[PDB]
Design a protein around this ligand. Structure first.
Ligand SMILES: *CC[C@H]1/C(=C/c2[nH]c(/C=C3N=C(/C=C4\NC(=O)C(CC)=C4C)C(C)=C\3CCC(=O)O)c(CCC(=O)O)c2C)NC(=O)[C@@H]1C
Ligand SMILES: *C[C@@H](*)[C@H]1/C(=C/c2[nH]c(/C=C3N=C(/C=C4\NC(=O)C(CC)=C4C)C(C)=C\3CCC(=O)O)c(CCC(=O)O)c2C)NC(=O)[C@@H]1C
Ligand SMILES: *[C@@H](C)[C@H]1/C(=C/C2=NC(=C\c3[nH]c(C[C@H]4NC(=O)C(C=C)=C4C)c(C)c3CCC(=O)O)/C(CCC(=O)O)=C2C)NC(=O)[C@@H]1C
Ligand SMILES: *[C@@H](C)[C@H]1/C(=C/C2=NC(=C\c3[nH]c(C[C@H]4NC(=O)C(C=C)=C4C)c(C)c3CCC(=O)O)/C(CCC(=O)O)=C2C)NC(=O)[C@@H]1C
Ligand SMILES: *[C@@H](C)[C@H]1/C(=C/C2=NC(=C\c3[nH]c(C[C@H]4NC(=O)C(C=C)=C4C)c(C)c3CCC(=O)O)/C(CCC(=O)O)=C2C)NC(=O)[C@@H]1C
Ligand SMILES: *[C@H](C)[C@H]1/C(=C/C2=NC(=C\c3[nH]c(C[C@H]4NC(=O)C(C=C)=C4C)c(C)c3CCC(=O)O)/C(CCC(=O)O)=C2C)NC(=O)[C@@H]1C
Ligand SMILES: *[C@H](C)[C@H]1/C(=C/C2=NC(=C\c3[nH]c(C[C@H]4NC(=O)C(C=C)=C4C)c(C)c3CCC(=O)O)/C(CCC(=O)O)=C2C)NC(=O)[C@@H]1C
Ligand SMILES: *[C@H](C)[C@H]1/C(=C/C2=NC(=C\c3[nH]c(C[C@H]4NC(=O)C(C=C)=C4C)c(C)c3CCC(=O)O)/C(CCC(=O)O)=C2C)NC(=O)[C@@H]1C
Ligand SMILES: *[C@H](C)[C@H]1/C(=C/C2=NC(=C\c3[nH]c(C[C@H]4NC(=O)C(C=C)=C4C)c(C)c3CCC(=O)O)/C(CCC(=O)O)=C2C)NC(=O)[C@@H]1C
Ligand SMILES: *[C@H](C)[C@H]1/C(=C/C2=NC(=C\c3[nH]c(C[C@H]4NC(=O)C(C=C)=C4C)c(C)c3CCC(=O)O)/C(CCC(=O)O)=C2C)NC(=O)[C@@H]1C
Ligand SMILES: *[C@H](C)[C@H]1/C(=C/C2=NC(=C\c3[nH]c(C[C@H]4NC(=O)C(C=C)=C4C)c(C)c3CCC(=O)O)/C(CCC(=O)O)=C2C)NC(=O)[C@@H]1C
Ligand SMILES: *[C@H](C)[C@H]1/C(=C/C2=NC(=C\c3[nH]c(C[C@H]4NC(=O)C(C=C)=C4C)c(C)c3CCC(=O)O)/C(CCC(=O)O)=C2C)NC(=O)[C@@H]1C
Ligand SMILES: *[C@H](C)[C@H]1/C(=C/c2[nH]c(/C=C3N=C(/C=C4\NC(=O)C(CC)=C4C)C(C)=C\3CCC(=O)O)c(CCC(=O)O)c2C)NC(=O)[C@@H]1C
Ligand SMILES: C=CC1=C(C)[C@@H](Cc2[nH]c(/C=C3N=C(/C=C4\NC(=O)[C@H](C)[C@H]4CC)C(C)=C\3CCC(=O)O)c(CCC(=O)O)c2C)NC1=O
Lengths: 324, 57, 164, 162, 177, 172, 172, 164
């Protein structure tokens, strides 16, 4: 269910319901012989967190038999399991070798640490370890510095914390959390901003640009926009997205100004009727009425209610309205 | 609330279809920001809008 | 897609290094072994329609209980799929000879195969009954070279050791 | 930029068309005239320093108040003389960019768009630059259809200043 | 990820076809000219450090406004990053030349580089000029026509390996343009 | 949008340089390749209805889930848009062939097309299959020496195939 | 937008109150400085071209990398956009001087100007020293008595220099 | 070390799997090079004291400032430590030929050489002047075989690139 005012709570209706329930705390040093029905829950909870709701087939899991045996012996969760699991091949296949370097840093912050790289210096502190010491010490730097030990215990699974005020990052990194973790029924391969092949927060993670938060499950959860710069120095193109500033005389005339994001724009459903037009279906250049879905607008207050009716009566649906 | 008063239509060229696949030299040059123009080509959109609303003079 | 090239490149990429002299010496064997390995690949391309008939029919001699009602080979549309389920496997063995390594088998055939062969109640001892029959019905003077029937036989009991 | 190739694509994309023989003939006219255009840009590039120092001296003979009048707009200091020969090189460089591309596209983007607000603000007069470009037209030493190609882009820059 | 043999297999698995004999003639000449490919990677890696310090110095001597205060090679931190921004391009190209396919620089280097570079303010037209100089140095070592260093090979022709590596450098420029 | 001649000019202005003689002589080699380039573009634009229709018909033969009731290509309006989308991409690849670089394929065709297909529910991997079937239908036609002087133009068919790969990895 | 009069009115409607007598007095005090305020705006307006074109010339003389090729103000398209921006800041400062509070300057000129120059690549610290030069050029030009009756006018040029200081910190 | 055996075994160990068929083609490429590489190690093992004698003073002929008071070659004793400093790098090139990979170089000679040579004020440009002399003094049929001089020179460019 969506909303922010119904159950007097607002974080469990942004997709963080099942993450707000679990601890997985591993209440003993070594695993008790004779039994496995309690530490198997600890093993699999570490798998769904560190791999990020990924599917691991039973032959893929059986490659990592040795590790799962030492953790069930007298060894610990962070250094003998989560550090060993991130140096296997089942980890390096999905999060390292498929991506550029900054895709790997953004997923190690999400998987191991549970937060977001804010600013260029969190990237650069982790990028420089790879250039001098390879992959097997690049994973160590996410563990053996002064962030992991003060947040997670030696035997707690690294839960998500990039949304709460205790992780003293920023408020722009709050909005970047709800681009990485898009709900509980989602994985890293299964969200449309990173398909295990690219960098999810590339321009917005470097420049610390806050994003509009679109709740998973809302009408408009399919909103995605592509990137192009504008301005002749960086040699960019105008006309793709909307501006994020509302700068001129159109800022304060027609009231205050908002940024609206639309997603679903099909070719039927434009005119003032109920049915699709019949005939040629396209003009002579045969492009479309809307050459791409996911249009965004910048609109004043006194033009917000006529725009709203133009959006919805022509098939579109509103993903986010933020004030500018 | 004083609606606009009703007037009658008239026969014009634009009320009726042209069959015109593959237009020619008298096709009149769509200037759009849906083609993602660069800085040299957004100058041509601006001059075309000045020509249309103002005069050329 | 594990092979000899993608394992010495991933070793060099994970250290941030240029390809050293070890990475180039791993390819001089890939150049040497390719003639034996590609010779068995074309012997299996132009003969697969007869090996698949012979291999799948050795399944229904050790296992005649599949033909009963309720089991995996109950009707001819299901008996036909077991010939397809084997003709899929000989293609992935043909891919592993062209690539060089065991890339396409564990990526396209072995990955998650135990889940599919447990929900659908397909026995897995009748999958190894077909490949193990092909592996010892083999003449290395006649059907192949001597050194092509050691590369062809290696991917067959790799598939058996995976499915067992 | 406006090139002969991007103005054949844009007129075919406006009609929703594949590249017909109307458009293949137009790109072929670029490839025919590009032999005379690429030797004019090679001959203007290699003799550029002779043309810049010459054309800046031709402004100083014609308008000698620009070397005597005090003020930041004039070539009376050593700073203001290097900014003059800078500007002559900017105009000569854009002419070679239009010869390799074909069509007055590089100087429509880099030079002429916003040029009037620069000359008005810093009090530079466009008759200094016409006199410099009329030297380069008469002194580039080209002949035939190679001089015909070069002079057609010199005269475009003069017509935007005149 | 995908070398010259994995590229063939994934295009046969699209059709569910066996890799027969007519498609193995491109792969029988990949192996027959295999020593020339290893003689081509060895000519790049052996002087790769000199290839980078000449390419970004040659970029600066042409555009001297990169090292001015406000340029993008001004500080020591910015010039040190440029000296490895262009050493990691040469590294992933020599992976692509070794494997005979471009699926490692287009999947680990070129993906999302144009968004990364304009987030940082890196001038792309000078980044292409640094890559363009390294492409000229690369074909002058595949073919033995370098001015300041001749290497010891056998006799023959490598104009197909010289033009393959020049096509790997051109998709770097086509990615950040 | 840019062609190949203005790509090398936009890079020389950003450093304030004249073009050197090597860049001029590399541009005059592209001019004498010009008649062979217009042959490839003519060979594609004159078979354009058969590149689209055959590679469509070969796509719903091996993928019959697209046109089965409930599929993305099942109705007349959705079948007409799948044929428009195949024709658009083949149109903008032939535009980037006469230009010499893919700046017109990038912005006014391919920028925002993965985002558009994900909004509608179009299977973007099936679109990449249809683009690679128009590739080898027109790589095979540019290698046809019917009505041409027999010379060598293997370097521009390797260029034309690269613009089809550029459009196929950009929608998946 | 608000002036100094309607700002106080808008803060009273939110509470549902009349204006107190101590606020009618403080609003009547700035009426008595009416002629002194119009003299300042008339001085900045009458020299508006010379404030800008001297501050810009003094800016590229100390930062010559902004105009040497590849810089952010190297082309006449970009150079005319730089001179345009300097007299947008000057125009909205003198709007705020007439009104009395920075609401027109804060809303339709300054809100989002830091994010605009960051997203374009323009150095925001160089726009600060372009605004600081126009402050010292226009508080020295509002401090000369040629044409105005000599009284005291120092409580208002501390305000005018406070609007230039507000603009120079919200570009970085 | 980094060699051909240590690479395919570690990538087997980093994936929890037995030595596959692509793990054996790489050792096959070590057989096709050992007879073209161990005679480069044979020549360097019996001629080293004449190689380091002339390569060591090729740097002192190039950088003659080092024999000043306050420099790195102040006295005769610190000259003899530099000849010992150079007769280690030729010894490790000999070990990289024997192992086959560049493991002995970047674990005993390269790892930590930046921190050492910055601290003790030793110019690395005089190290690469002593190693570039050896790489250029080599004649291919006179000093070695035709392909033994390709192996030996491929490690003298790993030393120069790692110190630059
Ligand atoms: C010396 C000045 C510095 C500088 C200026 C510069 N600015 C731009 C581009 C833009 N500036 C704005 C700002 C406004 N536009 C408005 O209409 C208003 C009124 C409210 C403001 C405050 C905008 C929107 C742009 C982008 C639009 C455009 O390009 O015209 C540029 C051009 C940058 C480019 O590459 O496009 C310059 C050069 N930059 C400097 O170098 C100086 C430090
Ligand atoms: C022939 C020399 C005459 C002359 C020249 C002069 N020019 C300037 C200043 C500028 N000129 C430009 C022009 C351009 N900049 C561009 O980027 C382009 C397109 C590529 C053009 C055409 C600009 C922007 C300036 C001001 C900034 C600068 O470059 O320094 C000056 C200095 C004026 C001043 O007030 O500083 C001079 C002296 N003037 C003469 O007297 C000669 C006759
Ligand atoms: C074009 C790039 C060059 C050129 C290339 C040739 N190289 C030839 C043979 C060759 N090179 C090597 C060394 C290489 N193979 C390895 O295994 C390793 C290291 C692991 C390296 C560096 C070998 C072994 C050979 C084969 C010679 C032999 O029989 O031992 C070659 C001739 C063979 C052929 O063409 O088939 C050519 C042409 N030569 C040139 O002239 C240009 C500059
Ligand atoms: C302060 C920065 C100046 C300065 C200002 C003073 N002006 C004084 C009186 C005054 N000013 C004007 C002009 C104004 N009124 C208008 O209607 C218009 C536009 C149409 C303008 C520009 C007038 C008409 C008057 C006379 C009214 C009066 O006497 O108040 C003034 C008072 C004198 C004093 O007490 O010193 C001051 C201070 N004078 C300065 O010396 C500085 C430079
Ligand atoms: C002891 C284990 C066996 C036995 C071993 C012999 N093998 C001999 C030769 C040989 N084996 C292979 C295949 C092997 N080499 C590879 O590179 C790979 C995979 C990458 C494999 C599996 C080859 C290629 C050869 C070389 C000769 C050939 O087959 O053409 C061999 C002959 C050596 C000699 O006689 O000196 C022996 C003795 N043979 C036995 O009888 C015991 C039981
Ligand atoms: C089968 C009836 C479908 C079908 C299924 C596939 N699902 C694939 C991947 C996948 N699915 C989910 C969602 C699942 N995980 C959850 O936690 C929950 C609910 C709480 C659900 C419903 C996720 C997270 C993933 C990603 C797995 C991963 O990335 O490792 C999938 C692709 C698997 C793969 O690519 O390896 C398939 C084929 N597909 C079908 O065609 C029928 C309709
Ligand atoms: C079977 C023929 C043996 C036998 C096997 C058992 N081993 C049991 C537990 C166990 N074994 C190891 C060592 C294993 N892990 C490694 O990392 C390595 C080498 C690198 C090896 C050999 C460990 C660490 C453990 C701890 C338990 C665990 O990992 O979960 C075991 C008991 C399992 C249990 O207690 O639940 C058995 C039966 N024992 C036998 O009696 C025969 C001789
Ligand atoms: C109180 C005067 C306000 C109000 C406050 C609420 N804030 C709520 C949640 C919340 N707020 C922040 C922002 C805060 N945390 C930071 O780290 C920083 C900057 C460094 C700031 C300004 C965050 C991040 C969160 C998320 C919750 C968390 O971090 O633990 C909140 C809701 C709590 C809830 O959802 O149960 C309220 C009510 N809201 C008001 O009505 C008045 C105006
Ligand atoms: C023959 C030796 C077997 C046998 C085989 C059957 N397999 C059946 C379905 C089936 N098989 C697979 C695996 C196959 N598909 C692939 O894509 C690949 C690799 C590329 C392989 C090896 C799958 C995924 C499925 C399910 C999909 C489907 O139903 O078509 C099957 C049909 C059973 C059923 O679903 O009712 C049979 C009969 N059965 C035998 O009798 C022996 C053991
Ligand atoms: C020199 C040739 C260039 C130039 C280079 C700079 N690059 C800068 C930062 C930077 N570059 C990359 C891409 C790099 N990382 C990769 O993983 C790959 C491919 C696999 C490449 C090419 C990234 C991710 C970054 C971010 C910052 C970082 O992590 O170091 C850079 C910025 C340094 C700084 O801001 O302090 C520069 C200066 N820039 C130039 O002007 C010339 C043309
Ligand atoms: C390349 C993949 C083709 C091919 C191309 C060649 N064409 C050659 C010469 C040529 N082509 C044309 C026609 C072209 N020019 C136009 O202006 C127009 C449209 C109005 C078209 C269609 C002409 C007029 C010429 C003669 C001029 C010239 O020689 O450049 C040519 C040269 C012959 C050779 O050296 O082989 C080639 C290669 N020919 C092929 O074999 C493949 C299929
Ligand atoms: C030679 C032409 C150089 C030069 C060399 C000097 N090296 C000095 C000390 C030194 N060198 C090393 C590296 C070397 N020693 C090893 O054990 C190994 C590998 C097994 C290597 C490569 C080390 C670790 C040390 C410090 C310990 C030691 O002294 O042995 C040295 C003495 C300097 C001092 O300690 O004051 C010299 C003079 N110096 C030159 O003049 C040129 C550049
Ligand atoms: C056909 C092989 C595949 C397929 C195609 C398909 N596409 C659409 C819909 C759209 N395609 C576009 C793309 C463009 N429009 C443009 O103007 C341009 C030039 C810039 C491009 C690249 C757009 C905007 C739409 C939506 C508008 C529309 O409906 O026409 C559909 C219809 C989807 C729908 O539900 O309406 C289809 C079927 N689908 C397949 O399954 C094939 C793999
Ligand atoms: C401003 C300063 C400045 C420079 C430093 C040079 C830089 C330079 N060198 C080359 C061109 C080259 N550079 C090299 C590089 C090398 N040759 C060797 O023997 C070494 C291994 C390595 C240097 C350490 C090679 C092999 C070529 C091509 C052949 C040659 O010109 O020698 C090019 C190519 C031209 C181009 O296409 O853009 C440039 C710009 N030029 C300059 O104007």
């Amino acid at each position: 269910r969506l909303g922010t005012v119904s159950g007097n709570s607002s974080l469990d209706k942004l997709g963080l319901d099942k993450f707000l329930s679990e601890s997985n705390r591993a209440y003993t040093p070594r695993a008790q012989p004779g039994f496995s029905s309690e530490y198997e829950q600890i093993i699999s909870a570490t798998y769904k967190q560190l791999f990020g709701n990924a599917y691991i087939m039973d032959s893929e899991r059986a490659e990592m038999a040795k590790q799962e045996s030492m953790f069930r012996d007298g060894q610990l969760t962070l250094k003998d399991f989560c550090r060993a699991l991130a140096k296997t091949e089942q980890y390096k296949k999905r999060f390292f070798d498929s991506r550029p370097l900054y895709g790997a840093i953004e997923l190690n912050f999400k998987n191991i640490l549970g937060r977001t790289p804010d600013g260029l210096e969190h990237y650069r502190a982790k990028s420089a370890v790879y250039d001098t010491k390879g992959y097997e010490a690049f994973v160590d730097a996410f563990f053996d510095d002064g962030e992991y030990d003060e947040v997670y215990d030696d035997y707690t699974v690294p839960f998500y914390r990039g949304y709460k005020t205790e992780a003293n990052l920023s408020m722009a990194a709050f909005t970047h959390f709800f681009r990485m973790v898009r709900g509980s029924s989602t994985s890293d391969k299964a969200n449309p901003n990173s398909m295990q092949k690219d960098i999810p927060l590339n321009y917005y993670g470097i420049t610390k640009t806050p994003l509009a938060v679109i709740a998973p499950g809302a009408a408009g959860t399919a909103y995605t926009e592509s990137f192009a710069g504008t301005g002749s120095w960086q040699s960019g193109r105008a006309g793709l997205n909307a501006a994020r500033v509302a700068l001129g005389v159109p800022a304060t005339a027609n009231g205050k100004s908002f940024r609206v994001e639309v997603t679903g724009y099909t070719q039927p459903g434009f005119g003032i009727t109920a049915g699709t037009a019949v005939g040629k279906l396209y003009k002579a250049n045969k492009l479309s009425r809307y050459p791409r879905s996911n249009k965004s607008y910048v609109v004043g207050f006194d033009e917000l209610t006529p725009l709203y009716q133009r959006i919805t009566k022509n098939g579109g649906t509103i993903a986010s309205i933020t004030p500018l | 609330s004083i609606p606009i008063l009703k007037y009658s239509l008239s026969t014009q060229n634009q009320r009726v279809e042209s069959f015109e696949v593959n237009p020619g030299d008298e096709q009149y040059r769509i200037y759009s920001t849906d083609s993602l123009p660069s800085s040299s080509e957004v100058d041509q959109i601006i001059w075309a809008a000045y020509r249309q609303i103002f005069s050329e003079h | 897609m594990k092979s000899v090239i993608t394992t010495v490149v991933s070793a060099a990429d994970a250290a941030g290094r240029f390809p050293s002299n070890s990475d180039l010496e791993s390819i001089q064997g890939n150049i040497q072994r390719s003639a034996a390995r590609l010779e068995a690949a074309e012997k299996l391309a132009g003969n697969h329609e007869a090996v698949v008939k012979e291999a799948g029919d050795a399944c229904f001699a050790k296992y005649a209980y599949l033909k009963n009602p309720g089991e995996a080979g109950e009707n001819q549309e299901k008996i036909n799929k077991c010939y397809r389920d084997v003709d899929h496997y000989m293609r992935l063995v043909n891919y592993c000879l062209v690539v060089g390594g065991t890339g396409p088998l564990d990526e396209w055939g072995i990955a998650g195969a135990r889940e599919v062969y447990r929900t659908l109640n397909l026995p897995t001892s009748a999958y190894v009954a077909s490949i193990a029959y092909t592996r010892d019905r083999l003449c290395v003077p006649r059907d192949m070279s001597a050194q092509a029937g050691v590369e062809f036989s290696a991917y067959l009991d790799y598939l058996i050791n995976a499915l067992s | 930029m406006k090139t002969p190739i991007t103005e054949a694509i844009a007129t075919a994309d406006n009609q929703g068309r594949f590249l017909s023989n109307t458009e293949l003939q137009a790109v072929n006219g670029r490839y025919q005239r590009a032999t005379a255009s690429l030797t004019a840009a090679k001959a203007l590039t290699g003799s550029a320093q002779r043309l810049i120092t010459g054309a800046a001296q031709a402004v100083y003979n014609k308008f000698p108040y620009t070397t005597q009048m005090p003020g930041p707009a004039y070539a009376s200091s050593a700073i203001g003389k290097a900014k003059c020969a800078r500007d002559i090189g900017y105009y000569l460089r854009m002419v070679t960019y239009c010869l390799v591309v074909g069509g007055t596209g590089p100087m429509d983007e880099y030079l002429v768009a916003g040029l009037e607000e620069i000359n008005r603000s810093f009090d530079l007069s466009p008759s200094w630059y016409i006199e410099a470009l009329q030297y380069i037209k008469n002194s580039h030493g080209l002949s035939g259809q190679v001089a015909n190609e070069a002079n057609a882009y010199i005269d475009y820059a003069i017509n935007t200043l005149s | 990820m995908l070398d010259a043999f994995s590229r063939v297999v994934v295009n046969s698995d699209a059709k569910a076809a066996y890799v027969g004999g007519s498609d193995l003639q491109a792969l029988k000449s990949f192996i027959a000219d295999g020593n020339k490919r290893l003689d081509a990677v060895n000519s790049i890696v052996s002087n790769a450090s000199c290839m980078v310090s000449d390419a970004v110095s040659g970029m600066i001597c042409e555009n001297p406004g990169l090292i001015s205060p406000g340029g993008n090679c001004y500080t020591n931190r910015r010039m040190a990053a440029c000296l490895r921004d262009g050493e990691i391009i040469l590294r992933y190209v020599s992976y692509a030349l070794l494997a005979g396919d471009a699926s490692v620089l287009e999947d680990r280097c070129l993906n999302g580089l144009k968004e990364t570079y304009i987030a940082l303010g890196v001038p792309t037209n000078s980044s292409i000029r640094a890559v363009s100089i390294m492409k000229a140095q690369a074909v002058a070592f595949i073919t033995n026509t370098a001015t300041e260093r001749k290497m010891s090979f056998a006799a023959g022709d490598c104009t197909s390996l010289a033009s393959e590596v020049a096509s790997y450098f051109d998709r770097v420029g086509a990615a950040i343009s | 949008m840019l062609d190949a001649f203005a790509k090398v000019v936009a890079q020389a202005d950003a450093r304030g340089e004249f073009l050197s003689n090597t860049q001029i002589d590399a541009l005059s080699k592209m001019v004498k390749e010009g008649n062979q380039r217009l042959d490839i573009v003519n060979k594609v634009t004159s078979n354009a209805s058969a590149i689209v229709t055959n590679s469509a018909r070969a796509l719903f033969a091996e993928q019959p889930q697209l046109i089965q009731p409930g599929g993305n290509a099942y109705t007349s309006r959705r079948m007409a848009a799948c044929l428009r989308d195949m024709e658009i991409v083949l149109r903008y690849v032939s535009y980037a062939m006469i230009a010499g670089d893919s700046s017109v394929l990038d912005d006014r065709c391919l920028n925002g097309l993965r985002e558009t297909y994900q909004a509608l529910g179009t299977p973007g991997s099936s679109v990449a299959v249809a683009i690679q079937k128009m590739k080898d239908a027109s790589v095979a036609l540019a290698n046809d020496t019917t009505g041409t002087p027999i010379g060598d133009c293997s370097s521009l068919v390797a260029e034309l195939a690269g613009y089809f790969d550029r459009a196929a990895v950009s929608v998946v």
